[PDB]
Enzyme design. Sequence first.
Site, PDB file in Angstrom:
ATOM      1  N   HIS A 233       0.839  -1.224   0.000  1.00 20.90           N
ATOM      2  CA  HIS A 233       0.000   0.000   0.000  1.00 20.90           C
ATOM      3  C   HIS A 233       0.854   1.246   0.000  1.00 20.90           C
ATOM      4  O   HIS A 233       0.702   2.137  -0.866  1.00 20.90           O
ATOM      5  CB  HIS A 233      -0.923  -0.034   1.217  1.00 20.90           C
ATOM      6  CG  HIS A 233      -1.764   1.184   1.390  1.00 20.90           C
ATOM      7  ND1 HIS A 233      -3.113   1.216   1.079  1.00 20.90           N
ATOM      8  CD2 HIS A 233      -1.464   2.413   1.901  1.00 20.90           C
ATOM      9  CE1 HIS A 233      -3.590   2.432   1.343  1.00 20.90           C
ATOM     10  NE2 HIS A 233      -2.613   3.162   1.846  1.00 20.90           N
ATOM     11  N   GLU A 234       1.832   1.237   0.892  1.00 27.12           N
ATOM     12  CA  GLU A 234       2.808   2.273   0.983  1.00 27.12           C
ATOM     13  C   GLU A 234       3.687   2.348  -0.272  1.00 27.12           C
ATOM     14  O   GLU A 234       3.985   3.456  -0.747  1.00 27.12           O
ATOM     15  CB  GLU A 234       3.606   2.176   2.269  1.00 27.12           C
ATOM     16  CG  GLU A 234       2.735   2.378   3.525  1.00 27.12           C
ATOM     17  CD  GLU A 234       1.880   3.694   3.502  1.00 27.12           C
ATOM     18  OE1 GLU A 234       2.360   4.728   2.927  1.00 27.12           O
ATOM     19  OE2 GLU A 234       0.743   3.694   4.082  1.00 27.12           O
TER      20      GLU A 234
ATOM     21  N   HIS B  12       1.738   4.046  -3.013  1.00 27.75           N
ATOM     22  CA  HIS B  12       1.832   5.543  -2.844  1.00 27.75           C
ATOM     23  C   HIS B  12       3.183   6.020  -3.367  1.00 27.75           C
ATOM     24  O   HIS B  12       3.277   7.094  -4.004  1.00 27.75           O
ATOM     25  CB  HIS B  12       1.760   5.984  -1.349  1.00 27.75           C
ATOM     26  CG  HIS B  12       0.389   5.987  -0.760  1.00 27.75           C
ATOM     27  ND1 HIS B  12      -0.642   6.708  -1.293  1.00 27.75           N
ATOM     28  CD2 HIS B  12      -0.102   5.423   0.372  1.00 27.75           C
ATOM     29  CE1 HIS B  12      -1.738   6.523  -0.573  1.00 27.75           C
ATOM     30  NE2 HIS B  12      -1.421   5.810   0.487  1.00 27.75           N
TER      31      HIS B  12
ATOM     32  N   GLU C  66      -6.020   8.171  -1.656  1.00 22.52           N
ATOM     33  CA  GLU C  66      -6.251   6.897  -0.876  1.00 22.52           C
ATOM     34  C   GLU C  66      -7.176   5.880  -1.523  1.00 22.52           C
ATOM     35  O   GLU C  66      -6.829   4.681  -1.637  1.00 22.52           O
ATOM     36  CB  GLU C  66      -6.618   7.220   0.580  1.00 22.52           C
ATOM     37  CG  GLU C  66      -5.441   7.778   1.395  1.00 22.52           C
ATOM     38  CD  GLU C  66      -4.282   6.788   1.732  1.00 22.52           C
ATOM     39  OE1 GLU C  66      -4.404   5.624   1.297  1.00 22.52           O
ATOM     40  OE2 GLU C  66      -3.403   7.272   2.455  1.00 22.52           O
TER      41      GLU C  66
END
Lengths: 8, 417
Positions: free
Chosen positions: B223-224, B227, B256
């Site tokens: 997820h990071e 980003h 997000e």
Amino acid sequence: CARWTKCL
Amino acid sequence: MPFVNKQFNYKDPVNGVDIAYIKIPNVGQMQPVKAFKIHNKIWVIPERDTFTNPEEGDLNPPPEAKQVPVSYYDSTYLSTDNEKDNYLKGVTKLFERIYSTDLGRMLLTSIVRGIPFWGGSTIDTELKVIDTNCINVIQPDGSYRSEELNLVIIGPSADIIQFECKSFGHEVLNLTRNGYGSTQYIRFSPDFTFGFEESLEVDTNPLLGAGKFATDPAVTLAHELIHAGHRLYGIAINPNRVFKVNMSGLEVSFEELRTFGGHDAKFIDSLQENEFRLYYYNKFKDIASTLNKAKSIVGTTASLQYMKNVFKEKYLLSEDTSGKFSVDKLKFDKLYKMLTEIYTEDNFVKFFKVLNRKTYLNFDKAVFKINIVPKVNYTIYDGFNLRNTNLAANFNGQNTEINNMNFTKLKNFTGLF
Ligand SMILES: [Zn+2]
């Protein structure tokens, strides 16, 4: 700010 | 062919190459920290991040009844050599799990190719690196050399579960939103994870559930990294662009929702998506024009044409007769869509075959202490759901009630909202 409840 | 080709121990001696004392360009002072280069362009610093933000130097809380609900403080976490060894091994293991999927291989390849743009020069005929996209590495002779990099994984700041992707700004340029990119620092721990609920009506309710299932930390890291991919290609969405959630002025950023993907990404309306896509395509054209005007380079770590080729490859630019660069709409749209729609948490969940929250818009139930380094607890291939045991099926390995020895509940968040 991820994470929803930490950026509310 | 592993992602991390050495199995580092924290106490392995420094060599000034891939095990080194480094300084980061925070614009203030710091004692060097021990860092480990786990892949081309990617470093791991097993330290609590008291360095990226000079005003988050303190590992102690805001006072006992000062603090946010979904938060966890422990000023001693990651202070000892054994915990740093274990952090290093845990993070490596999650890169390998990610890399072992084809989606993860694609995402990590796009991150390594995503070198922050050399737009630091004030003369538009000259190409220069921006120094905040570098670290300073102490060499064996005890002098410093500057080294470009794309990604640092570092431990969390005071709030242990505040995981996020940060980067050093520029005085004028918006680096994560102008197509240029900047080096990304992820605050992350493989030593904790979040509890969630298998029923959607429960998981999205603030008053219910104790957090029966544990999030696979490979999903959390991915997820990071997603980003980070956006921020390296300079296409992150301004966090002021939000979707209004519908009892409390609750909002969620578009950045997000995009990162989660699945049903959530559909809440970003089509006119706004077209508007961002056009915007970033224009940014890329400005990069193509900047490259066309570059006649000279600064430094001699690489040739002008080495670097032009690097950015041609990064941004997938077309090259004509003159060696004039342009952006092709088709190739821009494929890249753009790769980084925003193919790389998403929800997609990662299918690859890893794990149980996960169904929406970014959920209320976290709990936080658990975990240890993924022993193979009896967690593997590259299966995470916690270990093949040919009772934890293989039905996500039993993530089930904190069945696999209870791998999870210690540290805090309940339910009710506290
Ligand atoms: Zn996020």
